[PDB]
Copies of this chain bind each other. A is one copy, B any other.
Amino acid sequence: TYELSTDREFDLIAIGRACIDLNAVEYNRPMEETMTFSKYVGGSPANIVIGSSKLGLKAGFIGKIADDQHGRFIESYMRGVGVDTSNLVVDQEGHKTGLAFTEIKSPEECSILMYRQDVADLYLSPEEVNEAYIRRSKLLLVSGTALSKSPSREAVLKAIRLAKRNDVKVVFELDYRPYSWETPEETAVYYSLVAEQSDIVIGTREEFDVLENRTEKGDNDETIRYLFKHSPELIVIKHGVEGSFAYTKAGEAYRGYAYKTKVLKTFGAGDSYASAFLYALISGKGIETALKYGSASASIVVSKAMPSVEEIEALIEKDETITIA
């Protein structure tokens, strides 16, 4: 589709969390032994828009930030890397920015100590969601964790409605954070509802299991038979080293491959995947190639500071992928 129904200024606008990541400087050790932390912007939709801007996409953001040095850093950083920050709203009720402290015990053992209670990003409200902003974009990227609590949950539902009625493609990134939710069945309720309304849904197989209210691994053919009764036209299901699979409502299926990588830290793999996959799609590369872009970007981010197009393309050309799994 080489021209759209309306003129678009943004490639994507994401909605939900922009927070602080505090990354362990001394790593491959228990966090108790980590004495210094480096400050970064984090949060799945924030990471996706920052990664997208690094690839040259024009990105915007709908989210709530704290009225303090952490919120001002997040705004200044995003603006400095070329993300539009016009629709970042400053919380006026004393709410703090969420914090993720990262522990890297080894390449295979990484985890986050999260400060998530009553954080500013969860107080984004429907009245702060602007139709005039959303309609200037090709895509609306919705992250699942933004559905974990009201009023953010209703702000997201409002955003999706406004996107759909302005011919803005709704991309749902499943982004599962179990400790942000009360129960997995609660997660299933909102994930199913939102996926059914969305145009593109991207998640791991485990995340689709949650969506479907399952406690055991589901079958991709059943997943898509279900969701293709509803709005989605494209469903991307990721299986880590077993690769990734994209399915279209027209009945085609495409396969992507994990890249061989010297892993340092696995955080951010999924946000790098989404940004590069969407970049490829928006850039006319087609689904099969888009899967390589997402996979290559994921590999670079965990071994590196988000990937450049040049780094992604060099890794794709080198073509050292995993096919044995």
Interface-lining segment among A55-63, A112-120, A242-250: A112-120
Instruction: Contact check, B185 vs A126: say whether CB atoms are below 8 A apart.
Output: yes
Copies in the complex: 4
* Cβ contact of A182, chosen from B30, B69, B99, B151, cutoff 8 A: B151
* Cβ contact of A126, chosen from B99, B103, B154, B186, cutoff 8 A: B186
Tell me the interface secondary structure of chain A in the complex: mixed
Instruction: Contact check, B68 vs A113: say whether CB atoms are below 8 A apart.
Output: yes
Closest beta carbon of chain B to A127's beta carbon, Å: 6
Instruction: Contact check, B39 vs A39: say whether CB atoms are below 8 A apart.
Output: no
* Cβ contact of A37, chosen from B31, B39, B186, B189, cutoff 8 A: B39
A189 and B115 contact, Cβ closer than 8 Å, known pairs A31-B69, A69-B30, A73-B32: no
Q: How many residues of A contact B (CB 8 A)?
A: 42
A126 and B189 contact, Cβ closer than 8 Å, known pairs A36-B39, A37-B36: yes
A161 nearest CB neighbor, chain B only: B192
A32 and B72 contact, Cβ closer than 8 Å, known pairs A37-B37, A151-B186, A157-B193: yes
Closest beta carbon of chain B to A187's beta carbon, Å: 10
A35–B77 alpha-carbon span in the complex (Å): 11
Q: Does A70 contact B (CB under 8 A)?
A: yes
Given A22-B37, A37-B37; 5 other pairs, CB 8 A cutoff: A70-B101, A125-B183, A127-B185, A150-B186, A161-B192
